[model samples]
Target chain A: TKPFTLPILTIGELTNSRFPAPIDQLYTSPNADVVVQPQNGRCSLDGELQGTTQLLTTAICSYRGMTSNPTRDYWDGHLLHLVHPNGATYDPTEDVPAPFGTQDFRGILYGVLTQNPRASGDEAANSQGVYISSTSEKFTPKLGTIGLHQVQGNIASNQQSKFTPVGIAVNGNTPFRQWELPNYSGALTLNTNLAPAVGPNFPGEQILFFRSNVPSVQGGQPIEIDCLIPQEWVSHFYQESAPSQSDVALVRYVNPDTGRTIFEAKLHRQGFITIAATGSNPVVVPPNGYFRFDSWVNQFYALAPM
Target chain B: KTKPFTLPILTIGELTNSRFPAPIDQLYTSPNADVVVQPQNGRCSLDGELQGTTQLLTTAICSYRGMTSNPTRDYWDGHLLHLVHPNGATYDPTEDVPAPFGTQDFRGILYGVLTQNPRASGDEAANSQGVYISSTSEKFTPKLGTIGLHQVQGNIASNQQSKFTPVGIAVNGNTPFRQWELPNYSGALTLNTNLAPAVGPNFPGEQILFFRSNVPSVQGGQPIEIDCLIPQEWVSHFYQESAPSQSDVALVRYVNPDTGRTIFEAKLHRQGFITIAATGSNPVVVPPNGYFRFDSWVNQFYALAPM
Candidate 1:
């Protein structure tokens, strides 16, 4: 009575739907560098024995227009400012390097128009309105394993926006907001019933505006909410990838109701952060980064986005 | 579990030429008695309306000699009796009344005749003469129960001078031998297993015997022995036929010679006792009609052994 056998490891068809891209993303800090240091001079040969040498020079500046825009009108209702070329830049004296120069960070932002896919056309067929202002970044260190740099903030009817966004607000001050939009246009097109309010003083708060009109088009539609933010809060505020790392900036976005600003994008920390759907609307930028503006005291900074 | 039937062979040998007799002697009967009488006292009353009175109250007696006509100069030495009274008297009311005063005496007696040759003709001249008692005191009476004697030896050549003389009489009062005897017989006149000894003093512990030998040339002489007694306290109290006290002494004996012959017997009365009690012995109960009697003068051992 002893013949029963069962051993199966059939993994026959999972060809290669992607795996093996995370050896810490080749050493982070992708494109945000500025270093200039060179002082090595020693031409002293008894010039009255007066010693004052300064020669060995060096200069490396790389802070280009740090930008990324997979359009949705550049992220409505803006206030984005993401910086971490290897961090440590704004140092009045010292101490600032916890999640990227203190105030916590780890970036990801694709053309985020989330209200779970609803708003469209003439402000949603004109009620003299427009909606789509879905920007989510509630960062309790970006819950459940980070993947949320969504950016679609378009609340336009009127606007007065200045952007520099990357939050941390339980009053441990990391505020960077400047948005103003009032006369809607089809409620600014963000859809699929959005719901984003969470607590802990809204710590890394960025759930901008939400209103879905549910018309099923299925792109990156996922907005079911009940306070999530726990994958050990993004490995306790990110900084994981190693060995010649490359992608870092975790989240940043501003949309003064569509007066855009989204920068520092490197986040393929290992697949999954897609908002792609181009022409039929869904687009949130993270298709390989590189976009910039703000150079000549900027006035009409446009690179892509009619 | 299958052979269900056939087995029953059992063989040995020598049952001596087999003329068909020993089925244990056809169920034992050797205490020979034909008639024996010896009661003149010890109370012998007889008139019990008898008719051969149970074979003349158990007949067992003998003595004979009868030969005549010069076959060897005539001879006569006789005494033969056979009485069983059970009505044989004849007042001629058409023949019935016989017991002790009427007819049942079954009488017989022949005392040394010699009236010049009284009835001894053939068979060695009737073995030399003896037959003459004419009505023997008008049909013999005086012997009742209790009369025993047993002697046996015959085949050596007539040197034992056999004699068994008692004849006719029948009385009863729970008869257990009222009288009987067997004195000596000199050596070799045939019949001397040890010179006839036993007499009577209320003898019957049980008895019966009968014999009549000597027929060298045959003219009429056959019987040799036919016994039947069996006592041993009547086979230790009633030889069961579901015994309820049954022994009127129909012949019994066995005084234990390592206990042999006494095939069946019975006698219970003292009302038949019983005793059982258990639980580690407490039995001894005896008195409900009491009966464990073997006292016979302390030869006291009667549990069983006659049949």
Candidate 2:
């Protein structure tokens, strides 16, 4: 069969080039599927109603090589830099100097790319040029010397000869974001087969997102993102005796490519209040919103692409 | 009517004119009453058998003044002297003196009825002829010196010393004595009326001697003498059963001249041998066959004489 090419960018080339372009021009076809999911927009990582967030559409990423030894001089192994929506830049290390506003990142980066040209596998032997793509609508540039559009079609003789990238090369962009909007809330049902129901019962909702078609070459299956609103925040919406008063329900979202499920935080109401339906049994606010599977940056690579 | 005082002519004139001087009608006479003498026929071998006779003899002689004053006097002052035998005699004190008189010394026969009073000489001549004296007499005839004789004295003498005297005498002269004639005889009689009549052939024989003095010359006028003879065999027979057998037989003497009563009693058992002396109140128990001394109540003797 004829080998096809796709538009993508190599993070190694984009970090060292003097000029970088928009992340969209790296694709082979504009109609190509840009499969990425927000890392924060998923179910909470702890508490009752574990893993109950549903998908909300957005551009997301599954970062790889983000946990490599940072002490090595390789730019991919160092920490990621980020830019806020205000167009300010931040270096995660050495605290970006004061006038540059603080920027937030997940300490990682990602794109849709082809396998390396020097890979020993037959699929790579028959491949054309490498490609990369973004699921975010906006583009972020690297420094003035190097931007995301400058490193297209840079080939390597072997997978080990691929370029290394620094986290600064992926600065200055608005990543796709979503908040977890959970359907099931209230007290987390334990030891029973039914899932907890949503709303007036649970104060805050849990949110979920997925980024698909991630190149398995980075690690495991495509990654998903989950976030929590914490039952404490939504507890203000309901009456003192409303079911949403004490919700510790958690949600678990599964990656379609791998069977692995990530547990979101347990959602609960923010204060003590009795549920009108079960009077005198006061609802309580959830103490935390944590992800069970994405605890450390290195855990992001443990998922194998499907 | 004149009765002639006639005299019978003396035919024997020479016999009458003899020296006997006409025998001038002698007026003094011997008594016609003779003395009847009987001896005691039995002899007592034992003592107190003779105590009554001894006391009788002693009392009779002691009251005779003439006999008591002279031991050898032959005169008895008309006092009858009762002599059993050779051992007893009485005499007038003017003529003689006293002698021992008792039963053991008696012997010979018994003589009685003798008297003397010269002042009543004519009365004696008138009663029994003149001087009718004889040694023998007819049986049952009046004799001189007998028991129950009258006119035993010749006269009543006026001399104070020569007053009327006893005319009775019993002299044991020649005959066997009356007390010596019986066997086992004692001089005491058993006068108890309750004794069984004795059964010997001579039972009730010669038990007592009776003497009476009616002469005025005897003082107090009446004198009776009872001499009792007890047959030894009869006494022995009754002495075993005598009442009060253990007590001594006492010689009890009693005299009541007015009743002409005399008692001479003695018990001849072994107790009869007791003697109470005239001078002592001590009682004496004689040995069998021994003698008891005689005693008298002189006043009783005086009251016992003739009144």
Best by TM-score: 2
- Give the lowest summed-lDDT range of ten residues in model 1 chain B: B14-23
Write down the lDDT of every candidate, Cα atoms only: 0.18, 0.20
lDDT of 2 by residue, B30-63 (tens): 1112322222212222322322222211112211
**What clash count does candidate 1 reach?**
141
**For each model in turn, which proportion of the native inter-chain contacts is also found?**
0.00, 0.00
Task: Mark the regions of model 2 whose C-alpha exceeds 4 Å error after superposition.
Answer: A1-39, A42-81, A86-108, A112-244, A248-306, B1-307
Candidate 1, Cα interface RMSD = 78.2
TM-score of each: 0.14, 0.15
Over the stretch B21-94, how does candidate 1's per-residue lDDT look in tens digits?
A: 01001112122244353211111111111111111111111212121111111121122222222121211211
The iRMS of the candidates, in order, is: 78.2, 99.9
> What TM-scores does chain A show, candidate by candidate in order?
0.15, 0.22
- The model with the greatest lDDT is 2
Instruction: In angstroms, give how far residue A300 of model 2 lies from its true place.
Output: 33
